[PDB]
């Protein structure tokens, strides 16, 4: 249906190793591409224990298959095996940006570096008329040497000539733009709001309203003034957040524009410097 390139018998080409993740969809496993010995991530979904989101799982494969960017998790293919569908993607062993927050706070160079790479991902997606719709630190994954990529396209949307806006209530409430919660007509500017919340998340460790029940934020977000970054942070970082978190979507800058923001230019450095953060998490995790 949109599965034209669905492949068969994955275990000839890949080796399944241990489990590494879980979600509403099913489960995620480490694996090996037996042709290259590169390590991959295999998302496995039980088609029979699946229902309704079958319509989503296809959409996810569709979006993934259409992305070709170093800032988006590489897509290897979807494979059918008895009752299970394998969705095989690039493996990234550095941890998510949310993981890297667990041991302690980031500094603004690290925040800027991570945001700059997220922005390159968003610029790529939005130039392809795609909207991620679940931007948050947990879906920003790093290689063990500091490359930063967007992941989890489970609720990603696509715009077309006949569908210039979306309306669907998707995303993670703390990070959702007010127009998405209202289910008004929205586009890639929704991702820019979520990016602003993600910036606060990277700076403070958690998004606004994080101690509240997510249902409460469904009225708080459309109603309240937009969040701001409070605390002892640089003015350009605070202005970066402010630019993103405008209630009116057309007043938010594009990802391209944000790549030239003073905060990004003054503070972002080489991604390889992020190995320091990756090492911190490994040490921290080993002693938990
Ligand atoms: Cl890696």
Swiss-Prot record:
- The SS bond pairs are none
Domain named Protein kinase is located at 14-264
Q: Where is this motif: Bipartite nuclear localization signal?
A: 256-270
Record-listed Phosphothreonine modification sites: 168
Q: Where does ATP bind?
A: 20-28, 43, 90-92
Give the top-rank taxon of the lineage listed in the UniProt record for this protein.
Answer: Eukaryota
Report the active site residues.
134 (proton acceptor)
Q: What is the official name of this protein in its record?
A: Serine/threonine-protein kinase 24 36 kDa subunit
Can you name the source organism?
Homo sapiens (Human)
Specify first residue, last residue and whole-protein length for the fragment. Answer: 20 to 310 of 443
């Amino acid at each position: 249906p949109g599965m034209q390139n669905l492949k068969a018998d994955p275990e000839e080409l890949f080796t399944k190793l241990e489990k590494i993740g879980k979600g509403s969809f099913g489960e995620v496993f480490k694996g090996i591409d037996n042709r290259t010995q590169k390590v991959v991530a295999i998302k496995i979904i039980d088609l029979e224990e699946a229902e309704d989101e079958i319509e989503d799982i296809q959409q996810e494969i569709t979006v993934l298959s259409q992305c070709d960017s170093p800032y988006v998790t590489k897509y290897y293919g979807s494979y059918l095996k008895d009752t299970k569908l394998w969705i095989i993607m690039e493996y990234l062993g550095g941890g998510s940006a949310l993981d890297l927050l667990e041991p302690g706070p980031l500094d603004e160079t690290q925040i800027a570096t991570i945001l700059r790479e997220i922005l390159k991902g968003l610029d790529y997606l939005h130039s392809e008329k795609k909207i991620h719709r679940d931007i948050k630190a947990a879906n920003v994954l790093l290689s063990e040497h500091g490359e930063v990529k967007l992941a989890d396209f489970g609720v990603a949307g696509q715009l077309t000539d006949t569908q210039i806006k979306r309306n669907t209530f998707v995303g993670t409430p703390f990070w959702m733009a007010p127009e998405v919660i209202k289910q008004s007509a929205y586009d890639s500017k929704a991702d820019i709001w979520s990016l602003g919340i993600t910036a606060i998340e990277l700076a403070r460790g958690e998004p606004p309203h994080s101690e509240l029940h997510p249902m409460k934020v469904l009225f708080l977000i459309p109603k309240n003034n937009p969040p701001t970054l409070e605390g002892n942070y640089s003015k350009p970082l605070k202005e970066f957040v402010e630019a993103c978190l405008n209630k009116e979507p057309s007043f938010r800058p594009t990802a391209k524009e944000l790549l030239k923001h003073k905060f990004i230019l003054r503070n972002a450095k080489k991604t390889s410097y992020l190995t320091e953060l990756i090492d911190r998490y490994k040490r921290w995790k080993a002693e938990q």
